[PDB]
Amino acid sequence: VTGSGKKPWRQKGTGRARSGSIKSPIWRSGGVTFAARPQDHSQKVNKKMYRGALKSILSELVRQDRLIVVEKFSVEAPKTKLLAQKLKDMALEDVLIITGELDENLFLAARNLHKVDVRDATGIDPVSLIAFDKVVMTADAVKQVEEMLA
Amino acid sequence: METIAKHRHARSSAQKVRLVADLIRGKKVSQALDILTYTNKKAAVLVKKVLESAIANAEHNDGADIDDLKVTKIFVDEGPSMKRIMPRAKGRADRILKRTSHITVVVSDR
């Protein structure tokens, strides 16, 4: 805290409490006994534990029929309307389009939509899988998920 | 009808004018005027000006015939005070309170 180490008043005889500096935590305008430091909150998670969790989440989604396997899911042109129409007829509003390979047309189409999110198999996290109401995979996406899970 | 009349930030202290307020509280305006006229305090003239204003508001903004008017509610409440530093002996310093008050006058016929 900006200031000086000067004692505001001598240490005896005064009819006031003993003070050492104006920067004391119990003094106005300067203090904070335990000031925060910039620290990282990242936690280690075992690879087997992380993989085991994904298997559990995938199993649960299948049981609760929140996971749907379909053939290739692509859009002829990079237009959001086409993606919106292709989902309305399917009656999907909060969906995660997990595709085997990232496609620019699909990526651009889903970028504006917030309830619709498109990702690759590599780019999957447990939080996103649970958060999204439905997940639709592709045959290739499922196959690559099988092998890398092992 | 209420015909209130306030004078805020009066020079005198709230206490000192309360003595004058008690003299005229509940009494008819006719006797109130002379009592304040012949009372030897500035609070007398300070309150008298407020009482005169209250009568004027009643006569002008409301029904006439000020003769049948009584001071129903007279009270004073201390207002903001000004802090002043005054030197004392041995180099010490004290704070002088230039106190003020708000005088409210309410006169009604009934």
Binding site: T14 | K90, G91, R92, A93
Partner: peptide, 17 residues
């Protein structure tokens, strides 16, 4: 609203010795 800066030295006490 400055807090008193100069506090005088206390008056010497009566010798209780």
């Amino acid at each position: 609203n400055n807090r008193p800066v100069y506090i005088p030295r206390p008056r010497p006490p009566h010798p209780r010795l």
